[PDB]
Amino acid sequence: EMEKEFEQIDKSGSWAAIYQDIRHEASDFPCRVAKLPKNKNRNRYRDVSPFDHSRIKLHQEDNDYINASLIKMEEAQRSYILTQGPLPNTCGHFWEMVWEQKSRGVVMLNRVMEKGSLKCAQYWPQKEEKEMIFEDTNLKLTLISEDIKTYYTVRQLELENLTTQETREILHFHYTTWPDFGVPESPASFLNFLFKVRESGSLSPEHGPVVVHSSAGIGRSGTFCLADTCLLLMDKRKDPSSVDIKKVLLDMRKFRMGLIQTADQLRFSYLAVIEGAKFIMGDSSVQDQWKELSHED
Numbered sequence: 001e002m003e004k005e006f007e008q009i010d011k012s013g014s015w016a017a018i019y020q021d022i023r024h025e026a027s028d029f030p031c032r033v034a035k036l037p038k039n040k041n042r043n044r045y046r047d048v049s050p051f052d053h054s055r056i057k058l059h060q061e062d063n064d065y066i067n068a069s070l071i072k073m074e075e076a077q078r079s080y081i082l083t084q085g086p087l088p089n090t091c092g093h094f095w096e097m098v099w100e101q102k103s104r105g106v107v108m109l110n111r112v113m114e115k116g117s118l119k120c121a122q123y124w125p126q127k128e129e130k131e132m133i134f135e136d137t138n139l140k141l142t143l144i145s146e147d148i149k150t151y152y153t154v155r156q157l158e159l160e161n162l163t164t165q166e167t168r169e170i171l172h173f174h175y176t177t178w179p180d181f182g183v184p185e186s187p188a189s190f191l192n193f194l195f196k197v198r199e200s201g202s203l204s205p206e207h208g209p210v211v212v213h214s215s216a217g218i219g220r221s222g223t224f225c226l227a228d229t230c231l232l233l234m235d236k237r238k239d240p241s242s243v244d245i246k247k248v249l250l251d252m253r254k255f256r257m258g259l260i261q262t263a264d265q266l267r268f269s270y271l272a273v274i275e276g277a278k279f280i281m282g283d284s285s286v287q288d289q290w291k292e293l294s295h296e297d
């Protein structure tokens with residue numbers, strides 16, 4: 001059980017060590033392209049890059065680079081694209097990637113401004129009268145409507161390939177209360193938000209991979225993804241005990257570096273998967289409790 005392990009680590013107060021071990025066993029693949037001099041201004045953080053093997057390639061004959069990675073979870077049969085918070089010169093690229101990869105949803109786990117600094121460009125329109133047109137990638141983006149809650153907002157955006165005039169609806173799930181390098185207020189609010197994304201179809205296989213991002217695209221992003229895959233893995237068999245969280249986090253780190261930034265985010269991942277397992281096991285009432293506990297309205 002992950003719960004027995006949880007209790008053992010907790011009793012022994014060894015989340016730091018456990019996490020140092022993950023950091024030490026994590027894959028290390030080259031990030032040659034991320035490091036090319038022509039891509040310097042396309043990376044927000046010097047120490048956070050996409051491995052070449054899993055990076056998302058833009059279909060432009062100019063510079064196909066974007067700081068984004070495809071986390072392809074074989075056994076769980078679910079993919080996600082983790083990316084950094086778009087920079088002012090990479091918002092067109094970001095939306096280009098969304099169009100090309102056929103994503104239906106974008107999960108934003110950070111705020112534009114955090115800790116007195118700009119952690120991500122304002123890459124989507126905050127009002128409907130004012131659409132965005134990314135000239136470099138020939139795309140148009142319009143806010144259609146938004147549903148603001150206490151700690152998150154869900155937006156319905158319309159993305160148009162100005163070249164073909166094809167149009168797509170993109171859902172934007174914005175978690176506005178998760179501290180950079182922190183953990184959510186409670187498993188309840190996080191699971192409530194996670195099920196909002198799930199219930200939307202965004203995570204479905206009929207669509208391209210959902211784009212998940214934070215500021216670096218690894219801390220809060222990794223946390224979100226780890227919990228989801230773990231819950232999906234136990235869902236296929238209705239067997240929470242067959243899931244090894246550390247092992248799952250490690251398979252994910254083969255696709256992108258630094259997934260889950262602190263020992264507490266790791267600990268929070270366990271709490272979230274343990275609590276979410278109640279639902280997986282047939283107690284669907286727990287979903288209503290998360291809503292309550294979340295205090296979304």
Ligand SMILES: N[C@@H](Cc1ccc(OP(=O)(O)O)cc1)C(=O)O
Pocket residue numbers: 045048110180181214215216217218219220221261
């Ligand atoms: N380690 C760098 C870059 C970094 C930023 C954010 C971060 O987490 P998040 O993916 O959750 O935005 C991880 C790393 C920083 O501390 O500024």
